[PDB]
Design a protein around this ligand. Sequence first.
Ligand SMILES: Cc1ccccc1[C@H](CC(=O)O)NC(=O)c1ncnc2[nH]ccc12
Length: 167
Amino acid sequence: VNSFSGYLKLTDNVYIKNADIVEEAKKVKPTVVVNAANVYLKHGGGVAGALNKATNNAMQVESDDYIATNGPLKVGGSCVLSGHNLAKHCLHVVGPNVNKGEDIQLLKSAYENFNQHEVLLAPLLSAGIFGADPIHSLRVCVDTVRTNVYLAVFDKNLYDKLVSSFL
Ligand SMILES: Cc1ccccc1[C@H](CC(=O)O)NC(=O)c1ncnc2[nH]ccc12
């Protein structure tokens, strides 16, 4: 039993809700919140900008130190950093950005990072300003993630389409 509330159950291990991931994180304080990161951990917009803003820019400060030490992530890769006031940990995952020409096959690799964590709150990878088809992102999620994932979809209109079109 966990504290996630109001989710629709899609599969054995994948759940979904129309919710602002920022507000959802503040309420549940999950062990892991997933960020829709880029390889530079520059949290300017989209989910990343919103999560970072909610940390009062502490996420960005921590991220800049991480990059200065380690260099950029790989597309499809991830790193675990602090969850600040939102969660115990933030798993920064880099899905391919279609508006950068990056291989969509990398989306499966990106979701594989979720399997290292028993329970996660997460957005759809490569969705939103990353340019991929969110319906496809959901399919890859369900077919790749085996751990318990609670997906927050900000746009109500998109949430309804994702549910109504789910096979
Ligand atoms: C996954 C993604 C990647 C890039 C850009 C947007 C998104 C998603 C898309 C969706 O889930 O609809 N949007 C949001 O996460 C969002 N949108 C508006 N206000 C917000 N406040 C906290 C989060 C939040």
